[PDB]
Amino acid sequence: VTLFVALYDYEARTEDDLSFHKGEKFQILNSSEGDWWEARSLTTGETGYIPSNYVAPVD
Amino acid sequence: VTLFVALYDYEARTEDDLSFHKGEKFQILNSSEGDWWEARSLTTGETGYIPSNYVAPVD
Amino acid sequence: VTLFVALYDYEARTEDDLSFHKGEKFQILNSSEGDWWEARSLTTGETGYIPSNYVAPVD
Amino acid sequence: VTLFVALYDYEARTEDDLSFHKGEKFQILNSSEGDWWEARSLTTGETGYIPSNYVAPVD
Numbered sequence: 001v002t003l004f005v006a007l008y009d010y011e012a013r014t015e016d017d018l019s020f021h022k023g024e025k026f027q028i029l030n031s032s033e034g035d036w037w038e039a040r041s042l043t044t045g046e047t048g049y050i051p052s053n054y055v056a057p058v059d
Numbered sequence: 060v061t062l063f064v065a066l067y068d069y070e071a072r073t074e075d076d077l078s079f080h081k082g083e084k085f086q087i088l089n090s091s092e093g094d095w096w097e098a099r100s101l102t103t104g105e106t107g108y109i110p111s112n113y114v115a116p117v118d
Numbered sequence: 119v120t121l122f123v124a125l126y127d128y129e130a131r132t133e134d135d136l137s138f139h140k141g142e143k144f145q146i147l148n149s150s151e152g153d154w155w156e157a158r159s160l161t162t163g164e165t166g167y168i169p170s171n172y173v174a175p176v177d
Numbered sequence: 178v179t180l181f182v183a184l185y186d187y188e189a190r191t192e193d194d195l196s197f198h199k200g201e202k203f204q205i206l207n208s209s210e211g212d213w214w215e216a217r218s219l220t221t222g223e224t225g226y227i228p229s230n231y232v233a234p235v236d
Contacts, residue, residue, distance in 0.1 A: 007080075008080060013103065013104065035082075035084065035101075051083075051102055052082075053080060053081065053082030053083060053102075054080070089151055091150035091151065092148055092150065092151065139184075139185060139230060139231070140230065141212075141229075141230030142228075142230060143212065160212075161228055161230075162190065163190065
């Protein structure tokens, strides 16, 4: 399972976080040890940490 | 300090309460003034009252 | 609610604390946040933090 | 003992209270059952309630 969709919008707080919009999809290979996962957006191509509670596996 | 985590989404009514989404984690600032607790979101760093029956201790 | 009464005069340092004179009586609003209590003067109706070791319960 | 001097200034909150300045003297015949005493100022001639902790018997 590596495809996840955003449930809510999110505005990055720092340079390493990724901002994104609800409905946006990501590739997330491995989850982290924390609440923050490193993702790549399939829309913008950008990469960065996202809060793991904001996405769900794409059905 | 124990973290607490949101069980459900909650949308604030005024500027005093804090909107949050399920799974968001908080550090509690003041819990002894009543059932609404002053808390900081570990997600955004925002601060405000949250209804304590909407959160549980992490673990 | 128990009234408390000032044992000594006290002059506030900022706008948050409350200046008061010996014998002034207060009704306490919040006493569980620490040793500084949020109180209303029964004399002027002003509100602010007062150092709890400067007051005693009436009687 | 009926002569008392004011220890601090006081600005009346209502129409029945007497405002006064530190060093001002009053005649106070009988003390009340409460913290408020009915006084007459020997300076202005006015009469009204004053907080009893603000005056002391004139020595």
